[PDB]
Design a protein around this ligand. Structure first.
Ligand SMILES: CCCCCCCCCCCCCCCCCC(=O)OC[C@H](CO[C@@H]1O[C@H](COC2O[C@H](CO)[C@H](O)[C@H](O)[C@H]2O)[C@H](O)[C@H](O)[C@H]1O)OC(=O)CCCCCCCCCCCCCCCCC
Ligand SMILES: CCCCCCCCCCCCCCCCCC(=O)OC[C@H](CO[C@@H]1O[C@H](CO[C@H]2O[C@H](CO)[C@H](O)[C@H](O)[C@H]2O)[C@H](O)[C@H](O)[C@H]1O)OC(=O)CCCCCCCCCCCCCCCCC
Ligand SMILES: CCCCCCCCCCCCCCCCCC(=O)OC[C@H](CO[C@@H]1O[C@H](CO[C@H]2O[C@H](CO)[C@H](O)[C@H](O)[C@H]2O)[C@H](O)[C@H](O)[C@H]1O)OC(=O)CCCCCCCCCCCCCCCCC
Ligand SMILES: CCCCCCCCCCCCCCCCCC(=O)OC[C@H](CO[C@@H]1O[C@H](CO[C@H]2O[C@H](CO)[C@H](O)[C@H](O)[C@H]2O)[C@H](O)[C@H](O)[C@H]1O)OC(=O)CCCCCCCCCCCCCCCCC
Ligand code: CLA
Ligand code: CLA
Ligand code: CLA
Ligand code: CLA
Ligand SMILES: CC(C)=CCC/C(C)=C/CC/C(C)=C/CC/C(C)=C/CC/C(C)=C/CC/C(C)=C/CC/C(C)=C/CC/C(C)=C/CC/C(C)=C/CC1=CC(=O)C(C)=C(C)C1=O
Ligand SMILES: CCCCCCCCCCCCO[C@@H]1O[C@H](CO)[C@@H](O[C@H]2O[C@H](CO)[C@@H](O)[C@H](O)[C@H]2O)[C@H](O)[C@H]1O
Ligand code: OEC
Ligand SMILES: [Ca+2]
Ligand SMILES: [Fe+2]
Lengths: 77, 30, 448, 38, 137, 340, 335
């Protein structure tokens, strides 16, 4: 059905005026609730280094990598 | 020896140029 | 419809007005409104953010500094005294924008769609060599009066900011305009290369004022002459007479003025005071040399005989024609002249005795100021070299102006080529394709 | 062609949909990011 | 990994006594430091004389000591050479010379204290970066 | 038979042609594009390069990117369920699993797409020169994002997916491989640069050599979507260039084949050059030059000059660009000219 | 004689000349022969040039130790800056070759002629009854030579900072540029590569689509090219079959069916992109450089969290810190 017709159908907007902002507010909350940070192990502004340390948590060996990463989170990093 | 080789090729490209512009196959219609 | 697709394509819409004098007037009157609107609306924007006790160049200003130069709201050394003249100039324009905008909108959607009939005086014919030469003549006078409108402000109404001011930068009344043609027009015969800089080498207000006196007259003179004439013979067998062709000619004209402006704001010190704009490119590189020759000299170093890595002269060296200049990469800017640095120059260039004990504190801090405000910065406005750190948010007004106008100047030169190319094909008449039937090339002998 | 019917859940709908919903789920997050202070 | 009050607690005077800045003063100093210093002291160096930096140790061996709020503050009012054997208020911004360095006119004792605090706090956060130059960028 | 019915359905002419190829193309092509868009905004490169790399951390469209895996990983495929991530998703993300994901997926996606061209070509009954052409971009992707790092220590030295993250790939190659001096890279550019010329030049030659088939100025409408006569004077074009440049086409069939050749050959060459940079078999120096520079201190060419620029790039970058090497270059060891 | 000058003007302007020497040509032909002849001699035999004005001659000619790839014609001295240095400005040629005189003689004549070359690309189109604008496509590559050979030097204060005339000499211009302007991080350069990449891309698209949809008129063992005769009436390819295939690759409305709109796009894209690239170099000639995102993203304490933008800065510093070894005497590089 010719896009033109659909993007003009009041039915369309009646549906998407609900759907679009829906998706938006969802993603917004995804970030604003701090959930995204945990889904992607991404550091929060206060989690790059431990208070004193100025070294980087560089993963140094493949196989025991996951294990090594976990320990990096340990030093309150 | 190298200089000569560089200039020679250059001189050869310019020669080509000449022949290409002035000795092409006249472009015939229909 | 008065004008639709069976005229031109939508995206070439404004060319549908090539022959509707009236409406084509609304455009020009509505447009001229946008310029006043901007000028006005921007000034107030600048002033709204303007902080008196802080350099103008450190505030992203480019209009207030234009007013300041005409001697308005400033005093000793470019010190801002009264912000009223700024507010005024700003609001006035902003208002006139409404007046013009009115006329524009009016002439483009209510008034006559053509003029020729609603008044034969205003209506016009592109090919009417006389109407053209005449309207051109009217405008040649309006512009001429303007050129004098400046000569007046400077000689009678207040002055202009003269940075070269004897007592040190200050608003000064010019009462002795250079009228000597030998000098005035001398500038046009000046090289555009290093040293001899052509028009941009103007370095004192007398010539500026003087020269404008000449332009105002010479200009109005030609305004009358065109009013009272028609193009001769060659003038006619040489040019193309059409709506586009005329445009083109004015396009190439602006382009050229656009390039000249780019260089003026980049190089000139006089009509663009480093006090309101920033220090010039060369002026800043000069100041670094000044700064360090000044420093190290205090630490006990003999600047005159210091030998740098290359064996050329850490602080002072010689130019190609023998004059003593600052050393370092700054050897390329030995053509820089400036209030702050001149008192150190001798008849042979930088004098080792003055440099040795006549350097004044105001100069030391001037050199320091300008050194740390060179026209280097990023798009996101991070002053300094590309490898610098964030902190000092700044990009010299001289950099902004110069780039914007080179782009505009350029595209306009394309505009010229484009509209001129169209006009020549339009005239002879083939700007819409080769006549399938009579294909010119097909009647010419084979070169093969 | 046809007494001009057309189905609601078409085919291209999908194509333009798997590139739709997500595009918003992101441009909705990415905006909310601007408010993250230091 | 955050700017706690601790990182903000810096030496007030020569006799060991300290003061603790607040996230407001800090930011405020940082803003003022940009308004009247970055021009030449961006990142703790000194463009018009690279030999003297704002590293706390450098300020410690200064004369008089300029590595505490009291010190830097005096300096911003009546500047001197590293040996203090010469006043330079004429070619260095300071309160006693705001006529010559306008940017220093607004500046009030409250502002001077913040700027000073920033100088002692920055190296605490950045470390080597603060003192050195492009080598550390 | 269901097969021919499965076929029937697929090869059905829709808005967005699916086809057999699509069964490979769309799954991958979408996953590749998706993974990028995901990492660009959500995943970080901290545990991997000690770098913030997503919108969520503060990066803008230029600084964001899906960074390569650690150097520890080596050439590991880094599968979500492999020895590294161990089925875990978040860890996978932090170990740069998203790189081999985008890489490998997009890779198949380029296979699927070329196949598509091949499949659609066949159906529509046209020659497959659109597919031959696309071999060029495959080669680039294959040699650069796969073959290259496969020759190095690990995926870590492959170009990371991102705008800026690619500029460092460029700077690196100059600095370490002195890539600009490579005969193959040159051919590369001669082709891309020369190809972007044919493009522009041919386009203009056509638009300003058109016959008049309408009464309007906007000559776009004046075109016969249904063949017939040539829409522009091929005969006039020939004479123009033959008088301004001296040489000029005169066989649209060749003029157009040439346009396929130039840029596809260029990219092929630029690929070979890189396939060689994998083994570090670069075109770094000219021995005769180095020997004279050693014995004679006054000999200076724009070449020697460049090599010094490289030394600086390597010395000042290596530290934060190769973290796994725990480089420590004392200030006194850092090459630098005077004053700067 | 219908009148010598009357005749002269008829020859010059004659459209029957193998090579159209036009009015613009009268300026072109000489300037271009000087530029070319001086270059070739320079590149082969010119002696070392003190490009940086610090008495440290850089030899860039074949006979003085260079090969095609390294060799180049070196820029005028920095001691000279923007000053005009015509041969008649030197006590001798020896002095002129040492300060890089040949460079100016070449850039000026070339830029002069290459412009007229544009003026000519118009004239001939006029004498032949074809629409203009081709010369406007050529305004892009020209506007670049200009930016790289004149604007940048004017802006920077010296011709010694203009792009050298040689392979390696050009890489030098690039590597240093990047360090002082961070061009890769500038919108205009990016638009530039889009135009160039795109061009080559499209050049391949068109090229293939067309060549692949050619009407059969040739043998199985006969060059498919012969299927075209110079001076044909009808088209040589099925632009409807072409569009048919390409419309299915992506989707119909995202495909050209109007050969005129196709070819406009084909020309518009690269020319517009290169126009911006040329404006980039002409803009960064006044120090309005690329985006500087150094130390933008910083953490909760104030620590600096690097981005690829920073890894780029290090590579830039290396270039900065090493270029022009002996030319600097002070802290800031303002030249
Ligand atoms: C053939 C067809 C051709 C078609 C051609 C079409 C051409 C269209 C051109 C369109 C637009 C040109 C736009 C120029 C924009 C300039 C923006 C700018 O100056 O912007 C400045 C700002 C500022 O950024 C901020 O800069 C800031 C700080 O500066 C400073 O602030 C500090 C304190 O905060 C200190 O004071 C410091 O000293 C001071 O310098 C901070 O660092 C911030 O963290 C930082 O975010 O820009 C930002 O945020 C920018 C985020 C930008 C993303 C930009 C993408 C730009 C271009 C993409 C092009 C893709 C093209 C593809 C083309 C394909 C085919 C053609
Ligand atoms: C398509 C592509 C199109 C490309 C178009 C490219 C460029 C177009 C340029 C148009 C330029 C108009 C320039 C102008 O008005 O330009 C003026 C400038 C400036 O020249 C410089 O001017 C400088 C000094 O200014 C200053 O120095 C003075 C003391 O010396 C005073 O202090 C003064 O106040 C202060 O401002 C110095 O004298 C320099 O030595 C001198 O070279 O032109 C220069 O550089 C000019 C170099 C010109 C070559 C011109 C060829 C023309 C044919
Ligand atoms: C060649 C180079 C030419 C350069 C021309 C430069 C500027 C011309 C500018 C007119 C600008 C109006 C700018 C504006 O109002 O700018 C506003 C801001 C300014 O931000 C402010 O910038 C400010 C400061 O600048 C300045 O302030 C400083 C002191 O604070 C110093 O004084 C410094 O020198 C001075 O410049 C402060 O930092 C503020 O805090 C900060 O908020 O930036 C912005 O808007 C950035 C906007 C980016 C838009 C990006 C578009 C990307 C893609 C579009 C694609 C379109 C495609 C179409 C295709 C069609 C067909 C294909
Ligand atoms: C059109 C094109 C279409 C392409 C479509 C592709 C679809 C999918 C492609 C998948 C490719 C994955 C490659 C697998 C791989 O890289 O697997 C790589 C592994 C090698 O592992 C590597 O091993 C290295 C060193 O190991 C060796 O040396 C080590 C040093 O101590 C140890 O001693 C160790 O015991 C010893 O094995 C390092 O550790 C690296 O980190 C590690 O990645 O094996 C291997 O290569 C496997 C052998 C495969 C060879 C194929 C090469 C083809 C072209 C090569 C061009 C090179 C230039
Ligand atoms: C920048 C100035 C500018 C100006 C002055 C004009 C002016 C004009 N155009 Mg263009 N045009 C422009 C830019 C401009 N155009 C651009 C960028 C494009 C491409 C997008 C076009 C594409 C185009 C086409 C395709 C056509 C025109 C036509 C016309 C004429 C239309 C008359 C009409 O029916 O108006 C319609 C106007 C309105 C419904 C409302 C207009 C409101 C404006 C005037 C003012 C807004 C300001 C404010 C609200 C007014 C308050 C003032 C205050 C003092 C009280 C008119 C002379 C037509 C023509 O050829 O006519 C002969 C035509 O077919 N134009
Ligand atoms: C820029 C060029 C321009 C031009 C050529 C015209 C031309 C014209 N206008 Mg427009 N107009 C303009 C701008 C312009 N106008 C603007 C910006 C506005 C917005 C206010 C208007 C609003 C406007 C209206 C509302 C009307 C016209 C009308 C007319 C026509 C009137 C007939 C006539 O000659 O009386 C022009 C009148 C005078 C010259 C007398 C004005 C006297 C005083 C008040 C002002 C003098 C102005 C100036 C500073 C004098 C300089 C003197 C010198 C010695 C220093 C005429 C064709 C009328 C019309 O529809 O005609 C068909 C009409 O009703 N115009
Ligand atoms: C699209 C937006 C645009 C904008 C915002 C600007 C903005 C500006 N341009 Mg620019 N320009 C543009 C496009 C644009 N331009 C284009 C397309 C070109 C063609 C290439 C140019 C070419 C150009 C040049 C060549 C120059 C500028 C300049 C300027 C600045 C001029 C300041 C001024 O007073 O205006 C100009 C104002 C007028 C013409 C009005 C005349 C006013 C006279 C009559 C009276 C003045 C009052 C008098 C002295 C007081 C007397 C009182 C009495 C009682 C005694 C300004 C920042 C100038 C500059 O300073 O650059 C650094 C400059 O030289 N521009
Ligand atoms: C100085 C005065 C001047 C004047 C009066 C004109 C007038 C005209 N030009 Mg012309 N032109 C000029 C300068 C000028 N030009 C220059 C300097 C160039 C070089 C680029 C051109 C290049 C040019 C072309 C290539 C064409 C014209 C055309 C036309 C006619 C167009 C009618 C129309 O509807 O345009 C309205 C124009 C548009 C809608 C253009 C779209 C512009 C978009 C892409 C960008 C707008 C950018 C905006 C300023 C920045 C913000 C962008 C945002 C996304 C952030 C009209 C008669 C057309 C014609 O038919 O001529 C006979 C045509 O094809 N001009
Ligand atoms: C002794 C001394 C002085 C020595 C040397 C001096 C010196 C500096 C020499 C430098 C030269 C040098 C060494 C260069 C190195 C680069 C080099 C040789 C690389 C070679 C290897 C290489 C790139 C191989 C493959 C890559 C490839 C395909 C490149 C293609 C480049 C190329 C030919 C681009 C086209 C440029 C061009 C002008 C095309 C014009 C086309 C045509 C004439 C248009 C006219 C035309 C348009 C129409 O639209 C229509 C319709 C018709 C009908 C028509 O006619
Ligand atoms: C729908 C598409 C689904 C695609 C993949 C689903 C993969 C599930 O993958 C599976 O996860 C479990 C953990 O929950 C992993 O389990 C792994 O980590 C755990 C610890 O956390 C170990 O104790 C275990 O020995 C190890 O194998 C498996 O190794 C992995 O293969
Ligand atoms: Mn060739 Ca521009 Mn780095 Mn100062 Mn020299
Ligand atoms: Ca906080
Ligand atoms: Fe074509």
């Amino acid at each position: 059905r010719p896009f033109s017709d659909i993007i003009t159908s009041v039915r369309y907007w009646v549906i998407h005026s609900i759907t679009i902002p829906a998706l938006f507010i969802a993603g917004w909350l995804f970030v604003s609730t701090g959930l995204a940070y945990d889904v992607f192990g991404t550091p929060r502004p206060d989690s790059y280094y431990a208070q004193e340390q100025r070294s980087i948590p560089l993963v140094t060996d493949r196989f025991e990598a996951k294990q090594q990463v976990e320990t990096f989170l340990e030093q309150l990093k | 020896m190298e200089t000569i080789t560089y200039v020679f090729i250059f001189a050869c490209i310019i020669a080509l140029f000449f022949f290409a512009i002035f000795f092409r196959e006249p472009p015939r219609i229909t | 419809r008065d004008q639709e697709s069976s005229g031109f394509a939508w995206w070439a819409g404004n060319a549908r007005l090539i022959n509707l004098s009236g409406k084509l007037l609304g455009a020009h009157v509505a447009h001229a409104g946008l310029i006043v609107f901007w000028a006005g609306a921007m000034t107030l924007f600048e002033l709204a953010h303007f902080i008196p006790e802080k350099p103008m160049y450190e505030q992203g200003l480019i209009l207030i500094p234009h007013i300041a130069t005409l001697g308005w709201g400033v005093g000793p050394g470019g010190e801002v005294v009264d912000t009223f003249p700024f507010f005024v100039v700003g609001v006035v324009h902003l208002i006139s924008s409404a007046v013009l905008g009115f006329g524009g909108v009016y002439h483009a959607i209510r008034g006559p769609e053509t003029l020729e009939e609603y008044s034969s005086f205003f209506g016009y014919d592109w090919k009417d060599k006389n109407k053209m030469t005449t309207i051109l003549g009217f405008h040649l006078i309006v512009l001429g009066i303007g050129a004098l409108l400046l000569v007046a402000k400077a000689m009678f109404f207040g002055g202009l900011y003269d940075t070269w001011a004897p007592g040190g930068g200050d608003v000064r009344v010019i009462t002795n305009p250079t009228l000597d043609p030998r000098v005035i027009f001398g500038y046009l015969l000046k090289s555009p290369f290093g040293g001899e800089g052509w028009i941009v080498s103007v370095n004192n207000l007398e010539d500026v004022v003087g020269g404008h006196i000449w332009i105002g007259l010479i200009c109005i003179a030609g305004g009358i002459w065109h009013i009272l004439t028609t193009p001769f013979g060659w003038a006619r067998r040489a040019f193309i007479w059409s709506g586009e062709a005329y445009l083109s000619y004015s396009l190439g004209a602006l382009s050229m003025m656009g390039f000249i402006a780019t260089c003026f704001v980049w190089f000139n010190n006089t009509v663009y005071p480093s006090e309101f704009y920033g220090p010039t490119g060369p002026e800043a590189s000069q100041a670094q040399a000044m700064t360090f020759l000044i420093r190290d000299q205090k630490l006990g170093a003999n600047v005159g005989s210091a030998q740098g890595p290359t064996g050329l002269g850490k602080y002072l060296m010689r130019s190609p024609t023998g004059e003593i200049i600052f050393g370092g990469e700054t050897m390329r800017f030995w053509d820089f002249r400036g209030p702050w640095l001149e008192p150190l120059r001798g008849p042979n260039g930088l004098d080792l005795n003055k440099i040795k004990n006549d350097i004044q504190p105001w100069q030391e801090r001037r050199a320091a100021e300008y050194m740390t405000h060179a026209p280097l910065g990023s798009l996101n406005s991070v002053g300094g070299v590309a490898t610098e750190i964030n902190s000092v948010n700044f990009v010299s007004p001289r950099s902004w102006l110069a780039t914007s106008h080179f782009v505009l100047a350029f595209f306009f030169l394309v505009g010229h080529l484009w509209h001129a190319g169209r006009a020549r094909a339009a005239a002879a008449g083939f700007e819409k394709g080769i006549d399938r039937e009579s294909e010119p090339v097909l009647s010419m002998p084979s070169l093969d | 062609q046809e007494p001009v019917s057309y189905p609601i859940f078409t085919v291209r709908w999908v194509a333009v949909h798997t590139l739709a919903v997500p595009t918003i789920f992101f441009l909705g997050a990415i905006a909310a990011m601007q408010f993250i202070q230091r | 990994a955050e700017l706690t009050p601790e990182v903000l607690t810096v030496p007030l005077n020569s006799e060991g006594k300290t003061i603790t800045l607040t996230e407001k003063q800090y930011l405020e100093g940082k803003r003022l430091f940009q308004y009247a210093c970055a021009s030449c002291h961006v990142g703790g160096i000194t463009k018009t004389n690279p030999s003297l930096d704002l590293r706390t140790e450098t300020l410690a061996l200064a004369t008089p000591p300029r590595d505490n709020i009291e010190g830097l503050v005096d300096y911003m009012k009546n500047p001197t050479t590293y040996d203090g054997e010469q006043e330079i208020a004429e070619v260095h911004p300071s309160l006693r010379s705001a006529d010559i360095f306008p940017k220093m006119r607004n500046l009030t004792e409250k502002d001077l204290v913040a700027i000073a605090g920033h100088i002692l706090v920055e190296p605490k956060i950045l470390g080597d970066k603060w003192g050195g130059g492009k080598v550390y960028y | 038979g269901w097969f021919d019915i499965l076929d029937d359905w697929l090869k059905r002419d829709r808005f967005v042609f699916v086809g057999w190829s699509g069964i490979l193309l769309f799954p991958c092509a979408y996953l590749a594009l998706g993974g990028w868009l995901t990492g660009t905004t959500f995943v970080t490169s901290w545990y991997t390069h000690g770098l913030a790399s997503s919108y969520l951390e503060g990066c803008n469209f230029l600084t964001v990117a899906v960074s390569t895996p650690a150097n520890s990983m080596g050439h590991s495929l880094l599968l979500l369920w492999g020895p590294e991530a161990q089925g875990d998703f978040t860890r996978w993300c932090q170990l740069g699993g998203l790189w081999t994901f985008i890489a490998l997926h997009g890779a198949f996606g380029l296979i699927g797409f070329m196949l598509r061209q091949f499949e659609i070509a066949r159906l529509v009954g046209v020659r497959p020169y659109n597919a031959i052409a696309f071999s060029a971009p495959i080669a680039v992707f294959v040699s650069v994002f796969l073959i290259y790092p496969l020759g190095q220590s690990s995926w870590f030295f492959a170009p990371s997916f991102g705008v800026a993250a690619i500029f460092r790939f460029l700077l690196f190659f100059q600095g370490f491989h002195n890539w600009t001096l490579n005969p193959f890279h040159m051919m590369g550019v001669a082709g891309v640069l020369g190809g972007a010329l044919l493009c522009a030049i041919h386009g203009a030659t056509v638009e300003n050599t058109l016959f008049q088939d309408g009464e309007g100025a906007s000559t776009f409408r004046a075109f016969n979507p249904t063949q017939a006569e040539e829409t522009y004077s091929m005969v006039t074009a020939n004479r123009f260039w033959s008088q301004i440049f001296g040489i000029a086409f005169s066989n649209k069939r060749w003029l157009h084949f040439f346009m396929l050749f130039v840029p596809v050959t260029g990219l092929w060459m630029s690929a070979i050059g890189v396939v060689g940079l994998a083994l570090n078999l670069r075109s770094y120096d000219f021995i005769s030059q180095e020997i004279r520079a050693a014995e004679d201190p006054e000999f200076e060419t724009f070449y020697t000059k460049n090599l010094l620029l490289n030394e600086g790039i390597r010395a000042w970058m290596a530290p934060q660009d190769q973290p796994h090497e725990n480089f420590v270059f004392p200030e006194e060891v850092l090459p630098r000219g005077n004053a700067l | 004689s219908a009148n010598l000058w009357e005749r002269f003007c008829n020859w010059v302007t004659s459209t029957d000349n193998r090579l159209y020497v036009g009015w613009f040509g009268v300026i072109m032909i000489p300037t271009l022969l000087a530029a070319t002849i001086c270059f070739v001699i320079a590149f082969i035999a010119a002696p070392p040039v003190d490009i940086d004005g610090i008495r440290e001659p850089v030899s860039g000619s074949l006979l003085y130790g260079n090969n095609i790839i390294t060799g180049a014609v070196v820029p005028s001295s920095n001691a000279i800056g923007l000053h005009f240095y015509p041969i008649w400005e030197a006590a001798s040629l020896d002095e002129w070759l040492y300060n890089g005189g040949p460079y100016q003689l070449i850039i000026f004549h070339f830029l002069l002629g290459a412009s007229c070359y544009m003026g000519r690309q118009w004239e001939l189109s006029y004498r032949l009854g074809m629409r203009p604008w081709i010369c406007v496509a050529y305004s892009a590559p020209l506007a670049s030579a200009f930016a790289v050979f004149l604007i940048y030097p004017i802006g920077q204060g010296s011709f010694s900072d203009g792009m050298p005339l040689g392979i390696s000499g050009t890489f030098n211009f690039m590597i240093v540029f990047q360090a002082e302007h961070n061009i890769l991080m500038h919108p205009f350069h990016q638009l530039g590569v889009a135009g160039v990449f795109g061009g080559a891309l499209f050049c391949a698209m068109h090229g293939s689509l067309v060549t692949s949809s050619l009407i059969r008129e040739t043998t199985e063992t006969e060059s498919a090219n012969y299927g075209y005769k110079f001076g044909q009436e009808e088209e040589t390819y099925n632009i409807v079959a072409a569009h048919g295939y390409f419309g299915r690759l992506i989707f119909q409305y995202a495909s050209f069916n109007n050969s005129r709109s196709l070819h406009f796009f084909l020309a518009a894209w690269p020319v517009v992109g290169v126009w911006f690239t040329a404006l980039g170099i002409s803009t960064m000639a006044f120090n309005l450089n690329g985006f500087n995102f150094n130390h933008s993203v910083i953490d909760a304490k104030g620590n600096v969290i690097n981005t690829w933008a920073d890894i780029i800065n290090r590579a830039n510093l290396g270039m900065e810190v090493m270029h022009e070894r002996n030319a600097h005497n002070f802290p800031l590089d303002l030249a």
